[PDB]
Amino acid sequence: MDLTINYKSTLGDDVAAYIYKETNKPAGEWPGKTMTATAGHEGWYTMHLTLDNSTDYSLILNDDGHGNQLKDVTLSTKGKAEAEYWFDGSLSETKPADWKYVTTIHYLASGMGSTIYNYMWGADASATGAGVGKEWPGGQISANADHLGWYDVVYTQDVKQNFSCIFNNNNGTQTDNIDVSVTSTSTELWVTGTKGDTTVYKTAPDSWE
Ligand SMILES: OC[C@H]1O[C@H](O[C@H]2[C@H](O)[C@@H](O)[C@@H](O[C@H]3[C@H](O)[C@@H](O)[C@@H](O[C@H]4[C@H](O)[C@@H](O)[C@@H](O)O[C@@H]4CO)O[C@@H]3CO)O[C@@H]2CO)[C@H](O)[C@@H](O)[C@@H]1O
Numbered sequence: 001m002d003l004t005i006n007y008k009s010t011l012g013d014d015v016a017a018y019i020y021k022e023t024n025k026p027a028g029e030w031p032g033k034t035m036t037a038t039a040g041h042e043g044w045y046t047m048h049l050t051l052d053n054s055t056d057y058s059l060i061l062n063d064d065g066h067g068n069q070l071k072d073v074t075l076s077t078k079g080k081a082e083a084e085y086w087f088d089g090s091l092s093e094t095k096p097a098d099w100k101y102v103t104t105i106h107y108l109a110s111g112m113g114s115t116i117y118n119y120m121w122g123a124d125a126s127a128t129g130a131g132v133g134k135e136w137p138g139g140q141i142s143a144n145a146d147h148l149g150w151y152d153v154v155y156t157q158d159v160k161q162n163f164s165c166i167f168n169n170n171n172g173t174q175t176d177n178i179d180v181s182v183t184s185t186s187t188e189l190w191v192t193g194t195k196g197d198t199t200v201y202k203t204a205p206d207s208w209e
């Protein structure tokens, strides 16, 4: 299942989430997984994880191995398909009012030129991003500066609504329909291939350098 934890740090700018159940440590050995500064939310840090929903887990927020940790709290994840938590004085599953759902999708363009488009449909009316309110081929998207051959598109919504999109070059090359499941306020996906050969990754693939 897709886990997301946001923490308004009270332990400094270097923090991690340690998760455990019966000696299972899905976020890694102590101190766990480092939480990255949350985009668009000063003071917050965020980590994502895939874990086995066969069980609940315990969470220990800490300063990433530098001697300080908060008291354990239970993540009642058993049987759930997804879960996003906010920790700001206490554990919450309620999105803060000012937060949006920001979905980032990376596409690896190979031998289809340097002008790439993203066509999008099915999102909430509040949606903003390259392809909103645009008929085929959609909106043109820029290249990822740090990753060669990749292009990025970001769709922001006020509500947690799934949608679909297609990457293309407006010249006969396009992906399969990409069905985007929004599982958190900072959902990230990686896409490769074209029609018949489109693959969607929920964690960065080896192709992501
Ligand atoms: O899952 C089965 C076990 O569950 C329980 O163990 C838990 C602990 O209760 C938690 O506290 C935690 O342990 C952490 C610990 O909190 C953390 O500080 C770190 O411990 C280091 C410590 O920093 C360092 O100073 C030195 O003392 O070594 C310690 C190593 O023990 O890391 C610990 C985890 O590796 O999580 C565990 C589960 O992983 C329960 O208490 C057990 O009885 C049970 O078997």
Ligand SMILES: OC[C@H]1O[C@H](O[C@H]2[C@H](O)[C@@H](O)[C@@H](O[C@H]3[C@H](O)[C@@H](O)[C@@H](O)O[C@@H]3CO)O[C@@H]2CO)[C@H](O)[C@@H](O)[C@@H]1O
Binding pocket: 121, 136, 166, 174, 177
């Ligand atoms: O929601 C209504 C509509 O949704 C689906 O249609 C989508 C297509 O499945 C999808 O491929 C895409 O179509 C584009 C073509 O791929 C592209 O080649 C070019 O011709 O532009 C098309 C978009 O105008 O998007 C549409 C939705 O706009 C679903 O399959 C339909 O059954 C359904 O009617």
